[PDB]
Amino acid sequence: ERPRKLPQLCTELQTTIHDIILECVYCKQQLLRREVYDFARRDLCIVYRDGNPYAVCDKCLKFYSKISEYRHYSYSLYGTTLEQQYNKPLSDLLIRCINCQKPLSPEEKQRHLDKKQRFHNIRGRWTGRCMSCS
Amino acid sequence: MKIEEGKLVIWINGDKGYNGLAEVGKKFEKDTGIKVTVEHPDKLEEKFPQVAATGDGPDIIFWAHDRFGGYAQSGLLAEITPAAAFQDKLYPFTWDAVRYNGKLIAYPIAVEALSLIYNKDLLPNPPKTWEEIPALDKELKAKGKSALMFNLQEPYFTWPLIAADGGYAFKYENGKYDIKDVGVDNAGAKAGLTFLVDLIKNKHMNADTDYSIAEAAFNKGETAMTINGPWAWSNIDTSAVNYGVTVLPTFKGQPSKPFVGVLSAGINAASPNKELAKEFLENYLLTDEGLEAVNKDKPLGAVALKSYEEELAKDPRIAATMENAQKGEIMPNIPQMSAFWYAVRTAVINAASGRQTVDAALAAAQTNAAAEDILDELLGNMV
Ligand SMILES: OC[C@H]1O[C@H](O[C@H]2[C@H](O)[C@@H](O)[C@@H](O[C@H]3[C@H](O)[C@@H](O)[C@@H](O[C@H]4[C@H](O)[C@@H](O)[C@@H](O[C@H]5[C@H](O)[C@@H](O)[C@@H](O)O[C@@H]5CO)O[C@@H]4CO)O[C@@H]3CO)O[C@@H]2CO)[C@H](O)[C@@H](O)[C@@H]1O
Ligand SMILES: [Zn+2]
Ligand SMILES: [Zn+2]
């Protein structure tokens, strides 16, 4: 199978994150350098169309994420219930911020537990909110 | 207001035999005392998931089966539990159309496929190929007529040509649809849609033609051919046009491949009348007399009930319907179907009007049809 993360894609292409030219899977526009770095920091996955690798630009990521939330929101749970459902601590679960898509840190997940803030399920994806997205 | 206990409210599309269905409801009420109200709201298939999500809506919703997986995924449909004796009364392939995640989510009613409908007085020998249409249209324009008019606003009607040389929605293998393998922007889809656009460029069709325009023109004897389903036949009858129903033209020697719909009846998960709805559907509608009452209003097509279909199959129009069906494909019922249709709708309208090239229109539709799946991958949990 093909590289799903930017570093492995960079290694296969013998390039670096500073140099790689990526296009958005949706709009096919070239990502700004800032968007390449953000893609890596948010731990997003390279997607393949017609055998070619693509990332995503910020405009399309926000557009389709907002659509997905507005159409496919399901229900919410407290963190302890997630831990019982999956039989794992929150630190071992991938829970992205609903606003910025970054995976939540363990401290942000513990903050949800302490402050009685529920996590939300959108299309089987569990989401919270990082600190920045207050 | 909330769904009323002790009555049945039914939604069915305005192109179906809703007056005939109301007659079945009248019989139900005569026998049982339970009133049945049949409504045909606009955009019922979009209204249903909205109102049913709040616990409201009709007790029973009719639509082709392609919408029902999305409803079931959202928990809006009751599971249906026909006994084995009842299941045996309907064709197995119709039950499969309404089977989602291994469970039956609706009752199948009738099998629909598009056919070529032609005016025998204007055109005794209809064309076997799409490629013949341009020359035939030039000939008919010289007589003050035209060759072909059909709805270009709904992708259901243009899909048979798009699919002919290789277009597809989702690849089907191992009894399963691969949502990651979409066939909207492949060379076969482009070839078919290019042929359609060329018909428009060359003044053999108009991009603005819709259902009403094509129906009026055919039923007035102004155009020699149309493409439509069985529900359209009774208006042609009353128009006194001498028409035939036949196999769709081939494209590049390949059959046109209509998407086959099974008109199906689902029970709202929020209905307090699930038992009455089952009694109505199994023991009043899905009988020879019940289906005949609907069919006499607007023809249903090839009904799911074997006993009645054995009579209808003797009608050459039904034989043609099933010939086209067998050359086409059963629509997926998966939740991704609606996004597929909205995406293809835009592609055909934009290409037909020249707003986009065929290539750009279909490239965008391929992406749009796959958009939620792409997002699931982007946000996925991978190494
Ligand atoms: O607002 C902008 C836009 O609105 C109007 O178009 C919209 C329609 O009014 C609306 O119903 C909706 O259409 C979707 C539909 O929701 C979706 O399910 C899908 O439809 C499929 C069917 O599911 C499928 O079964 C099949 O339908 C056949 C049917 O089986 C047969 O029995 C008979 O009834 O003919 C039907 C075909 O007409 O095929 C259709 C696909 O053709 O896709 C539809 C979209 O194509 O959304 C429409 C777009 O918003 C206005 O008409 C339009 O002018 C406006 O621009
Ligand atoms: Zn983009
Ligand atoms: Zn955030």
With the C-alpha atoms ordered B218, B223, B224, B226, is the resulting torsion angle positive or negative? Answer: negative
DSSP one-letter code for B282 = I
Å from CA of A42 to ligand 3 middle: 10
As a whole number of Å, the CA-based R_g of chain B is 21
Tokens of A87: 């039989």
- Structure token digits, residue B309: 């279909």
Domain B8-112+260-312: give its CATH superfamily: Periplasmic binding protein-like II (3.40.190.10)
Contacts of A65 in chain B (CB under 8 A): 375
Q: Count interface pairs A-B at CB distance under 8 A.
A: 40
Structure tokens belonging to residue B56: 């409201």
Second CATH level (architecture) for the domain A74-134: 2-Layer Sandwich (3.30)
Method: X-ray
Quote the CA–CA distance of B329 and A60 in Å, as a whole number: 33
Sequence-ordered list of residues with C-beta below 8 angstroms from that of B319, at least 6 positions apart, any chain:
B313
Going from the Cα of B371 to the center of ligand 2, the distance in angstroms, rounded, reads: 12
Looking at chain A, the domain(s) classified CATH 3.30.240.40 span: 1-60, 74-134
Using CA atoms, how far apart are residues B153 and B376, in angstroms rounded to an integer? Answer: 30
Q: For domain A1-60, give the fold.
A: CRO Repressor (3.30.240)
Ligand 1 pocket, mutate which of B48, B341, B355 (most atoms under 8 A from CB): B341
For the record, the structure tokens of B316 come out as: 């050459």
Q: Do A5 and B379 touch (CB under 8 A)?
A: no
* CATH 3.40.30.10 applies to domain B115-257+334-378: no
Q: How many CB atoms neighbour CB A79 within 10 A?
A: 23
Is B375 part of the contact surface with chain A (CB cutoff 8 Å)?
yes
Residue B50 Cα distances to A123, B54, B265, angstroms? 17, 7, 18
Angle at A18 between CA A52 and CA A101, to 5 degrees: 70
Nearest CA to ligand 1 atom 52: B153
Specify the long-range contacts of residues A83-88, CB closer than 8 Å, at least 24 apart: none
User: Within 13 Å of residue B152, how many CA atoms lie on the same side as its CB?
Assistant: 21
B8-112+260-312 and B115-257+334-378 share one CATH topology? yes
Q: Cβ(B244)–Cβ(B154) under 8 Å?
A: no
Angle between helices B371-378 and B358-369 (to 10 degrees): 60
What are residue A23's DSSP bridge partners?
Answer: A30
Ligand 1 binding site (Cβ under 6 Å of any ligand atom)? B 13, 15, 43, 45-46, 64, 66-67, 112, 154-156, 229, 261, 338, 341-342, 345
Write down the domain spans for chain B.
8-112+260-312, 115-257+334-378
Q: Which residue does chain A place closest to B374, by CA atoms?
A: A47
Sign of the torsion angle spanned by Cα atoms B295, B301, B307, B313: positive
H runs (alpha helix) in chain B: 18-32, 44-53, 68-73, 84-87, 92-97, 133-141, 155-164, 187-201, 211-219, 233-239, 274-280, 288-295, 306-312, 316-327, 337-352, 358-369, 371-378
> First and final CA of chain A: distance in angstroms?
38
Q: How far is CA A50 from CA B181, B277, B367, in A?
A: 10, 47, 11
Q: DSSP letter for B285, please.
A: I
Distance in angstroms (rounded) separating the CA atoms of residues B57 and B99:
23
CB contact under 8 A, B379 and A45: yes
What resolution (Å)? 1.5
CA distance A79 to A71: 23
* C-alpha triplet A109, A17, A8: angle, nearest 5°: 75
B246-264 as b/e: b if 16+ CB within 10 A: bebbbbeebbbbbbbbbbb
Helix locations, A5-76, DSSP H: 6-12, 33-41, 58-72
Q: CB-CB: which of A4, A47, A96 is closest to B374?
A: A47
